[PDB]
Structure formats: structure tokens, C-alpha cells
């Protein structure tokens, strides 16, 4: 073994006493927010993911924890694992219904949706003054403030963003990585 040095006492004591399961299925996930929203309310529930033998976990743990192992195999997809529970989802959609915070895909890699400009009150100043100061948007320093009056047509879908152009969208701290933490698999009591 190079990869499974400690896997027998990995989760064959974790789900040993747990019968009502909430699941997680994702690739659109962070780390910084992610494993520290693994630090959300822990103390009675544990968080983990499986790996390659989740294709075999249909026939690894066949020791009949609960006799409904048809509900176990065909979701070996994504960063998929186990966030256990006792009681149902009656208040679990009162916490993580719309949670997100991130940096975008790498240095200005792909991002699905579209933004739009609007005359609002921001009031910025020339900081690192080599980003966007002559590209057509008005950085007209209005005796202290900045109020945009233009309607630009740049933002598209499926982008591979260049040098300084990935800190114009990131000037507004925009992250397309939503993932309100879902529960997709039906398994209880």
C-alpha cells in the first residue's frame, strides 16, 4: 500500500453508530471557506469524504449497518462524502441556504455568469495606477470621488482572463463559486 495505510479504522468506526445521513456532493468548492465551514458546528457530527473504493464501498461495508445498501453506491461523483446527523432537514436549510465567499477560478480562469454596470456611489482613488486608467471607463477623479457614467460591453461567459483584467472583476470581490451546502441523497432513520 501507498495510499491506504490507515483505512480500516478510517470510517468503519465513524458510521458505526450513525444511521441518519446527510450527504455532500460538489466540485464547486473552496478550501479556506470549505474546511472552515467544516468547522461550522462540529462536536457531534463528523465530516469526511471517501475515495476510489467508494466504487467498492457497496461491497466493502457489506456487514449490514442498515439493510438499504442500494442507496449507497451510484453517487461516487465529485468531492463526495459524509456529514452525519440524527434529526431531519427541518432546520438545516436555515443556515447554508446561500453561503459563498471565494477568489475566482485561477488568475482569471472560467466563470459562468454575467455582471452589468450601473451608476452607483463608490468613490475610489488611484492606488496601483497601472490597471485600467486609460481603457475608456471614466476614472475622472471628481475632486475626491468616482462616479461612473458609462455602459461598457466587455463581460462574457467562459473566459480566460489576462494580466490585469482579473483584478477589475476582482475589484468588486466577485466569486462565481456558490455551493450552498446541498443534501441530495435520501436516507434517514
Amino acid at each position: 500500500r501507498e495510499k491506504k495505510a490507515e483505512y480500516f479504522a478510517k470510517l468503519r468506526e465513524y458510521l458505526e453508530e450513525y444511521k441518519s445521513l446527510f450527504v455532500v456532493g460538489v466540485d464547486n468548492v473552496s478550501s479556506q471557506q470549505m474546511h472552515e465551514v467544516r468547522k461550522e458546528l462540529r462536536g457531534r457530527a463528523v465530516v469526511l469524504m471517501g475515495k476510489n473504493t467508494m466504487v467498492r464501498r457497496a461491497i466493502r461495508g457489506f456487514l449490514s449497518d442498515l439493510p438499504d445498501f442500494e442507496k449507497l453506491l451510484p453517487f461516487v461523483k465529485g468531492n463526495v462524502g459524509f456529514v452525519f446527523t440524527n434529526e431531519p432537514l427541518t432546520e438545516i436549510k436555515n443556515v447554508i441556504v446561500s453561503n459563498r465567499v471565494a477568489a475566482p477560478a485561477r488568475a482569471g480562469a472560467v466563470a459562468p455568469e454575467d455582471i452589468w454596470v450601473r451608476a452607483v456611489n463608490t468613490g475610489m482613488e488611484p492606488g496601483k495606477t497601472s490597471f485600467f486608467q486609460a481603457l475608456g471607463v471614466p476614472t475622472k477623479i471628481a475632486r475626491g470621488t468616482i462616479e461612473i457614467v458609462s455602459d461598457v460591453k466587455v463581460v462574457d461567459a467562459g473566459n480566460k482572463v489576462g494580466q490585469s483584467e482579473a483584478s477589475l472583476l476582482n475589484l468588486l470581490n466577485i466569486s462565481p463559486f456558490t455551493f450552498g451546502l446541498t443534501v441530495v441523497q435520501v436516507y434517514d432513520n
Partner: protein, 94 residues
């Protein structure tokens, strides 16, 4: 309270700063124990000592942006005496 390289997590509100210090760790022995953390800072190093220092383990991550999740008692053996070398007072020194 401190003169070290001050991290700022400061969302300002009507000129009033966020009056808790995110506290670059310049006041971890010089508070009520020996002066050599901030006092005597340009005479020699501050990696000196393994002496009986503290058992105030609760307050330790109450200052520096509490992010343990599971156990804060694993981090209380782990900055003062590990990230520094002035006071640890236990032989988990590895």
C-alpha cells in the same frame, strides 16, 4: 497592545477602528510574566527559555482570530513555545 508588524483586519466605521487587536504576538510573555518579549527586543534573540509560564490556555486563541473548529487545546501547546521559543513548560518539544 504591541509594536510588531501589525496585521490589520479593519472595516472602518465613522473613524472608529475595530477596537480589538488582531495582535501580532509581541505581548505574549511581557504581559504579566517576564519582560523579554517586547522589552529587550534589540539586545539578543527572543528564542530563550523553556520555563514555567502559563496555564491560561483559554485566553490564548481568544485574541488571535479563533479558528480551531475542533480543539483549541491543540493550538495552546502550539504557538507559545512552538512558534516561539520562550515558554512551553511541557516536553512535547517536537
Amino acid at each position: 497592545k504591541g509594536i510588531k508588524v501589525t496585521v490589520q483586519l479593519k472595516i472602518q466605521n465613522r473613524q472608529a477602528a475595530a477596537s480589538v487587536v488582531p495582535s501580532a504576538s509581541s505581548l505574549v510573555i511581557t504581559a504579566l510574566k517576564e519582560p523579554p518579549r517586547d522589552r529587550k527586543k534589540d539586545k539578543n534573540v527572543k528564542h530563550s527559555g523553556n520555563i514555567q509560564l502559563d496555564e491560561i490556555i483559554e485566553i490564548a486563541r481568544q485574541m488571535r482570530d479563533k479558528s480551531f473548529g475542533r480543539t483549541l487545546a491543540s493550538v495552546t501547546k502550539e504557538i507559545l513555545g512552538t512558534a516561539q521559543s520562550v515558554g512551553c513548560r511541557v516536553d512535547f518539544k517536537n
